[PDB]
Design a binder for this molecule. Sequence first.
Ligand SMILES: Nc1ncnc2c1ncn2[C@@H]1O[C@H](COP(=O)(O)OP(=O)(O)O)[C@@H](O)[C@H]1O
Ligand SMILES: Nc1ncnc2c1ncn2[C@@H]1O[C@H](COP(=O)(O)OP(=O)(O)O)[C@@H](O)[C@H]1O
Lengths: 397, 395
Amino acid sequence: LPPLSLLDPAEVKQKSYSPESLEAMSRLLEIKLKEFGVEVSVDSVHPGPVITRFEIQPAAGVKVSRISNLAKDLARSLAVISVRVVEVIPGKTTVGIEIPNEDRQMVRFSEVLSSPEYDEHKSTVPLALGHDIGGRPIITDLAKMPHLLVAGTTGSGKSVGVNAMLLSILFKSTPSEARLIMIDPKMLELSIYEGIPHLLCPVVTDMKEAANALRWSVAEMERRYRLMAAMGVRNLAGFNRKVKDAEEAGTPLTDPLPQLSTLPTIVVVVDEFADMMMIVGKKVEELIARIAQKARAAGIHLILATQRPSVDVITGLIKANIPTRIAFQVSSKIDSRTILDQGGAEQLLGHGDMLYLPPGTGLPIRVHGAFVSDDEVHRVVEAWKLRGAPDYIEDIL
Amino acid sequence: LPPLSLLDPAEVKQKSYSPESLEAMSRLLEIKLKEFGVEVSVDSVHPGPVITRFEIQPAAGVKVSRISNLAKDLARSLAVISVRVVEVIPGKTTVGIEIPNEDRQMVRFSEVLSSPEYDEHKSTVPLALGHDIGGRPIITDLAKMPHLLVAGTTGSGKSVGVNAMLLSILFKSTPSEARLIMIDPKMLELSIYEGIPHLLCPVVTDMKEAANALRWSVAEMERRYRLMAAMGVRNLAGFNRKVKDAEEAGTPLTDPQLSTLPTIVVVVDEFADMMMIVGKKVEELIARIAQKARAAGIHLILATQRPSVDVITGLIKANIPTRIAFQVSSKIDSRTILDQGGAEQLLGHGDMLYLPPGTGLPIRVHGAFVSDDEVHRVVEAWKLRGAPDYIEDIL
DNA sequence: ATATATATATATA
DNA sequence: TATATATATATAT
Ligand SMILES: Nc1ncnc2c1ncn2[C@@H]1O[C@H](COP(=O)(O)OP(=O)(O)O)[C@@H](O)[C@H]1O
Ligand SMILES: Nc1ncnc2c1ncn2[C@@H]1O[C@H](COP(=O)(O)OP(=O)(O)O)[C@@H](O)[C@H]1O
């Protein structure tokens, strides 16, 4: 485990303007919406790093569709790039309008990881994603999702988000706990992660090797289910508690079908399963559906990623089994419905601005993706290559 | 029989939402509906565990569709998360507005079994599903359904639902009048039930052995139909009345001494894996069961995770008219199982849509939570009473 | 000005 | 490929 200070340090923040500017922008929003058909007063002003949520209290009779279907013209008349209308704030009566600022400060990855949520976290595969709309950091947990879609068009930060997730893995767990599998169909982005002991294979490029890696993941899932069936334990955390107590009790356990040890948590990232499905066919779709159907209790987790938010790629079989979605900036409302079963993803800004959809029944929480760069990535990868030796399992292909 | 005191005790409920706190909400609802186009008057209030139905009488000359289009904004302006406008309360002249409570309240299973409906129930296979939208216990016999599909996404309260159904079997029925075939294609979930005398086998692992057990079940159904045709018997309950004509009333019979033919409830945890791995001959077996087996003595609790045409075709659709649907992720899946819409609107954690046989109208049922410790207690209470009476040649 | 009807657009059996 | 549903648009209110 390298220390957290090997990242780029925190710069000087400059936002959160004088309250006369916030009151002037509140009165400007009231005047512009009054010049349109609606009439609404600004309730409260919440500043933020990138955007500034204006909670406004709609008057009698005015609907929310009459606020959502003129956001284009409101963003034009407020001289900003694009505005976003929150249809529902949880537990209030108002309607959130989020306006970008003049200067747009980035999200610093050390400022994300310097949080007590990440620092005193319980699990072994956390995923620090970035701040909320006001600077409060979001740190999710991949063993609670248990799978993850990522989409959004180019120039929006998909590979930067995947690198933020993978450094969130690599700053906490040893290779005895979180052992990765990386399937990069290009040679472009995820090729930098070579050498670290957290891998199982060299970073898989060709699609026959991708299908072989998914079939080996199916085999690992089946042998872990058979082993936990023999030992009667429902989940992997209880299994590791059992085997740790058995090894510390002086009588370690045995082969159900030698000596067993603590199993790691396999995280299988995929960078473009659009192109993977394109080259191979429906067999990859059936394998991803099988893994997303069964592999929660066996520790196999997925980080999917795709450029195209279309029905050819994110099919219904993938949507029904993976309930946690990340939505970056997409092209239009049809792409937003394909990724989140609802609108609201097209109104973003890009360059690290996502809509985290939490697992289960939920409302999308706007998260700003942490900007992790090639300096930090290369430095932490060389740190792990100097702190450990590579270990590849040969028969995965 | 095991005692009902094995379950966890009914904790004194956090009966929140005082009558002034709901009277103020009703006055606020009629004011915030009068601010929009409609005019309304609140008729009565039914406070409940999870969702609270506000029965409202609309004004003269206003339509339900105005309330339906106005629904999301009404849910926005009342400081709640969602709403659902029931277009028709059966038998009344009102419109049901169901506002979900912000306190998702757990339903303990002893709070469902202790109803007088369940204790005075006579059939061998009751299913304690949970409470209704109003909070009253809903007990539904399995013998009148006659089969039951279960579908819903991962983390919706499905294994807890199958555990509640099987404990509803086990808290009333002896090993004489009920006997379970547990087809568990996942190796992980329902191995906890191993040891009870209510099994015909150790709990089945492989789809090959599961298909062998289903062939055995087809053959047992066929010999039961042939013996009922020999005895001139019009259903299973008529043959248990012939059992009452037998040594139950102290007059023995012959073997054309016929004992009880136990009602078989075949649970399948994931038949999606089976019907995608081994093919469609299993679907031929399931269709030949599900078309005929009501008057036979073999029933199926089918559970899955793919409400799709790849799993649930039209073959296993028209023959199972009683379906449990948990939280699915699309209206397309809702039309795939319930043949209507409204299944993705569920609030998760066992809150299902019991679709009764006959009337094709959904009946929403909150799922009863049963923990794994209560399961170990019931497994212990059955292992301390009876050795496993197997027909071991099923595999 | 705006709820309704309708022609067509995309997703699925 | 035929169709069920969904979305944008005259239209008359
Ligand atoms: N938090 C952020 N702040 C600023 N820029 C960001 C942030 N996150 C991502 N980016 C931008 O996203 C770009 C990477 O996009 P990428 O994921 O490679 O798109 P694709 O993989 O679809 O081609 C980088 O050039 C970077 O400038
Ligand atoms: N009646 C209930 N009340 C509250 N939570 C419930 C209830 N029934 C089930 N659950 C929740 O559902 C979870 C189990 O889901 P499960 O049936 O295992 O889904 P799956 O089988 O798809 O994994 C449990 O963690 C439990 O908390």
